[PDB]
Structure 1
Amino acid sequence: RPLRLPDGPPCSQRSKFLLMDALKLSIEDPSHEGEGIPLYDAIKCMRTFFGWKEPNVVKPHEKGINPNYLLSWKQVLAELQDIENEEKIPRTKNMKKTSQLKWALGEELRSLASWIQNEFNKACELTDSSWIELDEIGEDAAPIEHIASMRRNYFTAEVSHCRATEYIMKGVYINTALLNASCAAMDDFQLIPMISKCRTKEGRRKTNLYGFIIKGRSHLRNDTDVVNFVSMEFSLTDPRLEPHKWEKYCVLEVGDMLLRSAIGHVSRPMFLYVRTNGTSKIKMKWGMEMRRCLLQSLQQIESMIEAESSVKEKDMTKEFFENKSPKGVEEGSIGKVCRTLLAKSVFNSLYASPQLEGFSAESRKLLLIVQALRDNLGGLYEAIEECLINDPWVLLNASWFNSFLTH
């Protein structure tokens, strides 16, 4: 019996920041006065783009006050325009407590949609930039063994350029900046750039601006206290193609960007995805630990190599990673196995939820029972299917589980 997935309107994006739809304004090998101060980097990234235009709503938020989102973006541009006149650019920028920001900061079954599988496919892909250093992975006090080192070097070469690794580092930066601001500027509506850093194929260091968040008041006495925030994120994705994906956003058109393409230079609109959101201390601490996704999925790989080494009474690291008993790789390559394991780990983090917890545990129990039944030939379903409500990541993993059943 396959799991019964819920009927209803398509599910919508619920991640803390854009994934496949993000857009970056970037600067190469930066060397301005104050390189490495987020606000300074953001302004320089902002100053590389000249296609800004009078913004307007193109996909209104059905349940929100759309003029306040518009006003909120215009305030960001205006207050950055002010900073450009203050001869000493401040280290941080606290927004005026305008009515639009006071509103935005707080003073149902859903069916599976195709976009979540597309997000996952996108997370498995390679990018043309590296997002981590060679020795990023691991925490060991002592120097590591030769074998462990070999395994780490092989794995890193496969995932350093991976999109899921960008999501890790993007998530790590934004959660660190937000948690630090929640502490250092409790009463301020601080402007917090969304930044990442990477190294191009040619070795050039590069700094990336995805957009901005503004945080609300944050007197976070405990781990579950919530700080509100507004996110404002660049994108080339036209929201009118998949509006169900964007139920929680107000989307603006804010510029036009000139692009290289397969058909030569082309001009495409630049959008700004705006929503209100919230997070807590404990979620921000987990966001800061997303590099553990790299360690956890390496350990799944090492688990596999250690099994092959136990059978062949010999270390199989080179044989495993160079693909040289197994006669192929189901995902196509060892590299794609690494990136797929990583993407599952990262999405478990980006889409963490009680629904995911229940589905994970309960579907595992049903798995083993189905395996043992195969190899040798209700109730648990209620536990599994009770978790299938509206979360895109859970619904996709259920769709995946159902394929595992037909085969």
Structure 2
Amino acid sequence: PRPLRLPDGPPCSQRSKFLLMDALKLSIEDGIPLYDAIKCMRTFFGWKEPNVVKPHEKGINPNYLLSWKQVLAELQDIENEEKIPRTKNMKKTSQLKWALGEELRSLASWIQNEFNKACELTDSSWIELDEIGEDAAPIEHIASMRRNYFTAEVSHCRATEYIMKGVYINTALLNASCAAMDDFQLIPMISKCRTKEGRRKTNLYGFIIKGRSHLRNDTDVVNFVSMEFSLTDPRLEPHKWEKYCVLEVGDMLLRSAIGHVSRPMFLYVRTNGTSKIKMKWGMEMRRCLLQSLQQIESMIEAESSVKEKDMTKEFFENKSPKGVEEGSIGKVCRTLLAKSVFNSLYASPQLEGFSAESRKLLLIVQALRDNLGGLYEAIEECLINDPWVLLNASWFNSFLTH
């Protein structure tokens, strides 16, 4: 029947907790986070006097600039102290006190592009061979072969970077929120990976500064300010960046398909917040690897029940089905993962309603198609402004044209 009526209005904007496809890393080829951050910072020499290039319409833009200058200034202090401290509590300046707090939207093309990027392979690997699972006992042979096949396909996947990025920053923020309750602690955004050649590498995405965090319960909120490197010029797609003040903070010399080029380096700045319970879920994002592995195993066990033999080799080596719609078994694994990871990155009540209610309508349209009102309101009451939900609604309407 009817396609879901998606809402008209200004394009939807980014609302993840940290940048996704736009992130930029300052890296070192190799664990106290602040020390890692500083060594990453000193690898870059194209810093310059920072200025606003895309203002935050609803924010106090001078304060965001003062805040970044303060970060560089207090890191400059840390460098002079003979012993680099374990943590750095920021001076409680007026700009930080302000920053720390002491409507229908249409679907924009950028969220589909984010998703596509999350399915891509990266040069580096983001997990260990035995990252997936938490068994007490040794795992049996068929389970081990399935985990090693699936692990080979998603260890280099971009969405796995997003998982480990997310795990690190939520663990550091949750820890700081009870170890340094009254401090405006400077918290590096770090990840770790292993290069194509097997070299261990440490990545700095930027920094967050947390506010006062007396989190008596799970829904209590701690505010923070994120400051994230990027090469994305925000002026190309300003609607994506409604929540940010974007600074130009340097220039970077790059290898490119035309040889060496200098590109501006930007800093995406926004205020944000999270709660205890959201930080605990952030710490469990590696579950996305486990849950999507199980969706794969649910498929192999279905095929194996038909063919009265184990079909793990035949499934993963793509050796009954004569192809793979997404292209390869590897792409299916990475699409499942990326969906699971984006469910985590863009979790919301709107996503919850859309999933459970659109599920009911799918079975009804499938049973109708095979053999041949109130659900629509429940579904469309969830189509408000969340980019991930709007995309999934758009995907659902494709399934409704075939």
Structure-1-length-normalised TM-score: 0.98
Match of 1:27 in 2: 28
Could you tell me how far apart the structure 2 residues matched to 1:152 and 1:89 are? 41
1:126 deviates by 0.1
Q: Does 1:75 align with 2:47?
A: no
Q: CA deviation at 1:326?
A: 0.1
Please state how far the C-alpha of 1:387 moved relative to its aligned partner.
0.2
The Cα shift of 1:153 comes to: 0.1
Tell me by how many angstroms 1:378 deviates. Answer: 1.4
- In structure 1, the partner of 2:9 is 8
Of 260, 276, 279 in structure 2, the residue corresponding to residue 265 of structure 1 is: 260
Superposed CA deviations along residues 326-376 of structure 1, whole A, max 9, x for unmatched, are 000000000000000000000000000000000000000000000000000
Q: Secondary structure at the match of 2:223?
A: strand
Q: Distance in 2 between matches of 1:262 and 1:338?
A: 31
Question: How far off its partner does 1:382 sit?
Answer: 0.2
1: CA distance, partners of 2:339 / 2:319: 26
Deviations 1:112-165 (A, max 9, x none): 000000000000000000000000000000000000000000000000000000
CA–CA separation in structure 1 for the residues paired with 2:304 and 2:83: 61
Runs of 4+ with deviation above 6 angstroms: none
Secondary structure class of the residue paired with 1:255: strand
Aligned to 1:193: 188
- Choose which of 156, 165, 173 in structure 2 pairs with 1:161: 156
Q: Counterparts of 1:90 and 1:292 in 2: how far apart (Å)?
A: 33
Secondary structure (helix, strand or coil) at the match of 2:80 reads coil
Query: Partner of 2:207 in structure 1?
Result: 212
Q: Following TM superposition, by how much is the alpha carbon of 1:48 offset from its aligned partner in structure 2, in angstroms?
A: 0.1
Verify: 1:94 aligned to 2:95, yes or no. no
Structure-1 separation of matches of 2:199 and 2:98 = 42
Take 2:147 and 2:393, find their aligned partners in 1: how far apart are those partners?
Answer: 32
Q: CA deviation at 1:269?
A: 0.1
- Give the drift of 1:241: 0.2
CA distance, structure 1, for counterparts of residue 260 and residue 299 of structure 2: 47
> In the TM superposition, what is the alpha-carbon distance from 1:322 to its structure 2 partner?
0.1
> For each residue in 1:87-132, what CA deviation from the matched residue of structure 2 results, as whole angstroms up to 9, or x when unmatched?
1111000000000000000010000000000000000000000000
Q: Distance in 2 between matches of 1:40 and 1:321?
A: 42
Gaps of 5+ in 2: none
Q: How far apart are residue 78 of structure 1 and its match?
A: 0.1
State the shift of 1:60 in Å: 0.0
Aligned partners of 1:107, 1:87: CA distance in 2, in Å?
Answer: 32
**What CA distance in whole angstroms lies between the structure 1 residues aligned with 2:324 and 2:254?**
37
Deviation at 1:64, TM superposition (A): 0.1
Instruction: Name the CA distance, whole Å, in 2 between partners of 1:341 and 1:263.
Output: 36
Write out per-residue CA displacement over residues 283-319 of structure 1, whole angstroms, 9 at most, x where no aligned residue.
0000000000000000000000000000000000000
Match of 2:397 in 1: 402
What is the DSSP-based 3-state SS (H/G/I as helix, E as strand, rest coil) of the residue aligned with 2:23? Answer: coil
Task: Return the alpha-carbon distance in structure 2 between the equivalents of residues 166 and 314 of structure 1.
Answer: 35
Aligned to 2:130: 135
CA distance in 2, matches of 1:314, 1:299: 19
Give how far 1:386 is off.
0.4
1:207 CA drift (Å): 0.1
- The alpha carbon displacement at 1:250 in A equals 0.1
Mapped partners of 2:375, 2:228: distance in 1: 41
Deviations 1:214-263 (A, max 9, x none): 00000000000000000000000000000000000000000000000001
Secondary structure in 1 aligned to 2:355? helix
**Percentage of matched positions with identical amino acids:** 100
Deviations 1:24-63 (A, max 9, x none): 000003xxxxxx1000000000000000000000000000
Whole-angstrom CA distance in 1 between matches of 2:298 and 2:80:
57
After superposition, the CA RMSD in angstroms is 0.3
Question: Residues of 2 paired with 1:179 and 1:203: CA distance?
Answer: 31
Q: Separation in 1 of the partners of 2:301 and 2:217?
A: 42
Which position in structure 2 is the counterpart of 1:335?
Answer: 330
Alpha-carbon separation, structure 2, partners of 1:383 and 1:174: 35
SS in 2 for 1:42: helix
Partner Cα separation in structure 1 for residue 316 and residue 33 of structure 2: 38
Give distance in 1, aligned partners of 2:70 and 2:373: 55
> 3-state SS of the aligned residue for 2:235?
coil
Cα distance between partner residues in 2 of 1:166 and 1:84 = 29
SS at structure 2 position matched to 1:97: coil
- Give 1:182 shift: 0.0
* CA deviation after TM superposition for structure 1 residue 320, in Å: 0.1
Q: Give the drift of 1:400.
A: 0.1
1:33 alignment counterpart = none
| Secondary structure at the counterpart of residue 171 of structure 1 | helix
1:183 match: 178
The separation in 1 between residues aligned to 2:390 and 2:165, in whole angstroms, is 25
C-alpha distance in structure 1 between counterparts of 2:200 and 2:375, whole Å? 51
Name the CA distance, whole Å, in 2 between partners of 1:394 and 1:4. 13
**2:224 aligned with 1:229:** yes
Counterpart residue number, 1:321: 316
The separation in 1 between residues aligned to 2:111 and 2:198, in whole angstroms, is 33
Aligned partner of residue 112 in structure 1, secondary structure: coil
Aligned residue pairs: how many?
A: 401
Give the secondary structure class of the aligned counterpart of 2:263.
strand
Question: Is 1:389 aligned to residue 384 of structure 2?
Answer: yes
Alignment-derived partner of residue 246 in structure 1: 241
* Aligned-partner Cα distance in 2 for 1:385–1:217: 38
